[PDB]
Ligand binder design. Structure first.
Ligand code: MG
Ligand code: MG
Ligand code: ZN
Length: 155
DNA sequence: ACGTACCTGGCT
DNA sequence: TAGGTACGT
């Protein structure tokens, strides 16, 4: 049951950007503070990486917990048009996996930064984020993800 | 003003 | 591909 009326829910949905979202803005700011001259929204790479760091041959995705189905407190299965959302979100999850595989096949190290780690009552501190980012980017560690519990290598 | 909880279409 | 709105602070 939606907390908005049709018109309002439509307005809310129309306001959602496809780049330069809240989580992308905070990550950009963190990377800029670190002195990294990164690129963004690379339509030439699989999944159009949110961020690209050529200098360390790595890319970074900022995942919205709803859109990418993170199994965290931010995600709830829609109670309206459930079938539609389950298929759409399910397809997003499958595409996310494929994108990561392709990038790796191209020689790119991938880092996933979940939204809950960037905003919300469980978000990591600026210091904690900056440290984990700098260590992962500048290091040679394989693909990983950052959630509220810190950083972890991808399966 | 601001942080969080509650919710789940639009635009290329 | 979050972010509008209601609420408590
Ligand atoms: Mg993107
Ligand atoms: Mg993203
Ligand atoms: Zn999450």
């Amino acid at each position: 049951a939606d907390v908005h009326d049709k018109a309002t829910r439509s307005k809310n949905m129309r306001a959602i950007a496809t780049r330069d979202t809240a989580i992308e803005k905070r990550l950009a700011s963190l990377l800029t503070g670190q002195g990294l001259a990164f690129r963004v929204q690379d339509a030439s790479l699989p999944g159009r990486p949110d961020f690209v760091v050529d200098e360390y041959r790595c890319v970074i995705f900022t995942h919205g917990c709803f859109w990418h189905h993170h199994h965290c407190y931010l995600f709830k299965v829609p109670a309206t048009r459930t079938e539609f959302w389950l298929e759409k979100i399910g397809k997003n999850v499958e595409r996310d996996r494929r994108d990561i595989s392709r990038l790796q096949e191209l020689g790119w190290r991938v880092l996933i930064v979940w939204e809950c780690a960037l905003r919300g009552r469980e978000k990591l501190t600026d210091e904690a984020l900056t440290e984990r980012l700098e260590e992962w980017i500048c290091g040679e560690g394989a693909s990983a993800q950052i959630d509220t519990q810190g950083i972890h290598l991808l399966a």
